[PDB]
Amino acid sequence: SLRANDAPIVLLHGFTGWGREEMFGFKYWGGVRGDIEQWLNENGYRTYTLAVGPLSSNWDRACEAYAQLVGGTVDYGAAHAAKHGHARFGRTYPGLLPELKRGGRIHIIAHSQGGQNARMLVSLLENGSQEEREYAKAHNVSLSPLFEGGHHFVLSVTTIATPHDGTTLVNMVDFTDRFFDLQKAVLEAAAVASNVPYTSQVYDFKLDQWGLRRQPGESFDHYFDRLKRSPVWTSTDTARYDLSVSGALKLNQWVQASPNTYYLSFSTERTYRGALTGNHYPELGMNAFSAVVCAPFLGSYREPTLGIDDRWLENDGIVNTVSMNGPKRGSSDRIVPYDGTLKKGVWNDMGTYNVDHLEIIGVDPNPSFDIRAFYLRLAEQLASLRP
Ligand SMILES: [Ca+2]
Ligand SMILES: [Zn+2]
């Protein structure tokens, strides 16, 4: 379709992810297939990459995304900081797109928990935070323009394999141990070891707010064990919490669709229905870690009281496919299956793809999936959107 808008693309990672200079240059967006930002740019779709805290709360990552985009010191809010016990202020950024302050807009393409992070940034841009505005007045302290409301610079959000209603994987007995083993597998796919105390940061978790950092002489193995016991794994202000079915419910209750923004969901599935009791099993080609450690659980876990029945068993290795088309559990957002015309203010469900959680970003191979073709056709669609 004809190009109707000049808004640039921002790629936003999941509960794992890292900037373009990190991980010795192994891109999260393209992995072993190449560099997805490079593909869109060289095909005339100007594209940028955000890097926020992968284990942090969506709230933290919205404030991190904001500063990273417009430029400034990350401002988590005086109130939120007091309530949860971390720094009000994080890293300073120069700003990728200061023209957002002057009328420029962006399309966000987000993977995994990134789709929650993207939705929430919109909701804060539009409404801000009553509580922050209240707190800034009471204790005579500065307010981020983010908490004010009346901002708007996101023309479209696209979610790819996003736990909008959470993932049942979080309810696994040993999820803690199994989740940081996922972080290690991603490292290994990056050709980075978990048992070597690298001098340089390699993978920065951006836990400035919690005063956490991998230390001189500290391995990722030893660091992850330490993060397991830390507030970025034990508190409600975390990716862990937001990622649970109860986390997404509580997020859905306050993070709604802006009428000024297009939402596209892409769902993923990489499972087959078994004959014995209708459980779901990993297809051939699923990333080894998911196929062994995550999928068997995802595609047999039931809670009939929490609505978690057979619709929840199909999974992309990591997320229950049903959770992906858009928010439902605790949401009044509308979900319309794609009919050739993209609608503002609603979820354009662009369908389910035979592609696993890590294949869809190229962190695992799948020759059957044309990853260049997928991301180009998406950029072409987002460029076609009426502003
Ligand atoms: Ca594969
Ligand atoms: Zn926080």
Residue 44, token pair as written in the block: 């005339």
Residue 115 neighbours by CB under 8 Å, 6+ apart: 157, 159, 160, 162, 163, 164, 265
Give the whole-angstrom CA distance, residue 221 versus residue 53. 18
Q: How far apart are the first and last CA of the chain?
A: 14
Give the whole-angstrom CA distance, residue 183 versus residue 180. 5
Residue 304 neighbours by CB under 8 Å, 6+ apart: none
> Is residue 3 included in any domain, yes or no?
no
> Is residue 258 included in any domain, yes or no?
yes
Give the whole-angstrom CA distance, residue 51 versus residue 118. 13
Give the whole-angstrom CA distance, residue 271 versus residue 169. 15
Q: What φ, ψ does residue 74 adopt, rounded to 5°?
A: -55, 130
| Ligand nearest, relative to CA of residue 354 | 1
| Ligand nearest, relative to CA of residue 358 | 1
> Ligand 2 mean position to 74 CA, how many Å?
11
Give the whole-angstrom CA distance, residue 358 versus residue 3. 30
DSSP-assigned states of every residue in 138-165: HTT----GGGT-----EEEEEEES--TT
> Ligand 2 mean position to 186 CA, how many Å?
25
> Ligand 1 mean position to 268 CA, how many Å?
13
> Is residue 1 included in any domain, yes or no?
no
How distant, in Å, are the alpha carbons of 86, 137, 174, 227, 333 from that of 231? 9, 28, 18, 8, 32
Q: Nearest Cα to 273, choosing from 292, 293, 300, 294?
A: 300
Give Cα 256 to chain centroid, integer Å: 16
The whole domain housing 50 covers 9-384
Look at residue 281 and give its three-state secondary structure. strand
Q: Work out whether strand 89-93 and strand 72-75 pair parallel, antiparallel, or are unpaired.
A: antiparallel
> Ligand 2 mean position to 80 CA, how many Å?
6
Alpha helices in 43-163 (DSSP H): 58-70, 78-84, 114-127, 130-138
Give the whole-angstrom CA distance, residue 122 versus residue 117. 9
Give the whole-angstrom CA distance, residue 318 versus residue 109. 19
Q: Is 151 a catalytic residue?
A: no
Q: What is the DSSP letter of 228?
A: H
Give the whole-angstrom CA distance, residue 181 versus residue 315. 19
Q: Is 246 a catalytic residue?
A: no
56, 112, 129, 230: the active-site residue: 112
> Ligand 1 mean position to 287 CA, how many Å?
5
- What is the structure's resolution, reported in angstroms to one decimal? 2.6
Q: What φ, ψ does residue 155 adopt, rounded to 5°?
A: -75, -35
Give the whole-angstrom CA distance, residue 72 versus residue 96. 10
Report the amino acid identity of residue 356: D
Q: How many domains does the chain have?
A: 1
Half-sphere exposure at residue 262, Cβ-oriented, CA atoms within 13 angstroms: 26
Look at residue 240 and give its three-state secondary structure. helix
Give the whole-angstrom CA distance, residue 348 versus residue 334. 9
Owner of token pair 């996922």: 182
Give the whole-angstrom CA distance, residue 36 versus residue 21. 15
> Is residue 239 included in any domain, yes or no?
yes
Report the amino acid identity of residue 31: G
Q: Work out whether strand 280-282 and strand 271-273 pair parallel, antiparallel, or are unpaired.
A: antiparallel
> Is residue 2 included in any domain, yes or no?
no
Give the whole-angstrom CA distance, residue 33 versus residue 359. 9
| Ligand nearest, relative to CA of residue 83 | 2
Look at residue 206 and give its three-state secondary structure. coil
Residue 21, token pair as written in the block: 């200079």
> Ligand 2 mean position to 232 CA, how many Å?
9
Q: Is 316 a catalytic residue?
A: yes
The method of structure determination was X-ray
Q: Work out whether strand 280-282 and strand 335-337 pair parallel, antiparallel, or are unpaired.
A: unpaired
* Contact between 265 and 325 (Cβ < 8 Å): yes
Look at residue 108 and give its three-state secondary structure. strand
Look at residue 229 and give its three-state secondary structure. coil
SS3 for 306-357, per residue? HCECHHHCCECCCCEHHHHCCCCCCCCCCEEECCCCCCECCEEEEEEECCCC
Give the whole-angstrom CA distance, residue 91 versus residue 204. 12
- What residues have a C-beta under 5 A from ligand 2, the ion? 60, 84, 237
> Ligand 1 mean position to 288 CA, how many Å?
8
Give the whole-angstrom CA distance, residue 234 versus residue 215. 21
Give the whole-angstrom CA distance, residue 33 versus residue 27. 9
* Contact between 61 and 52 (Cβ < 8 Å): yes
165, 208, 316, 364: the active-site residue: 316
Give Cα 333 to chain centroid, integer Å: 19
Q: Nearest Cα to 317, choosing from 364, 265, 369, 274?
A: 364
Q: What is the DSSP letter of 376?
A: H
Helix (H) or strand (E) holding 289: helix 288-293
| Ligand nearest, relative to CA of residue 239 | 2
Residue 87, token pair as written in the block: 């720094």
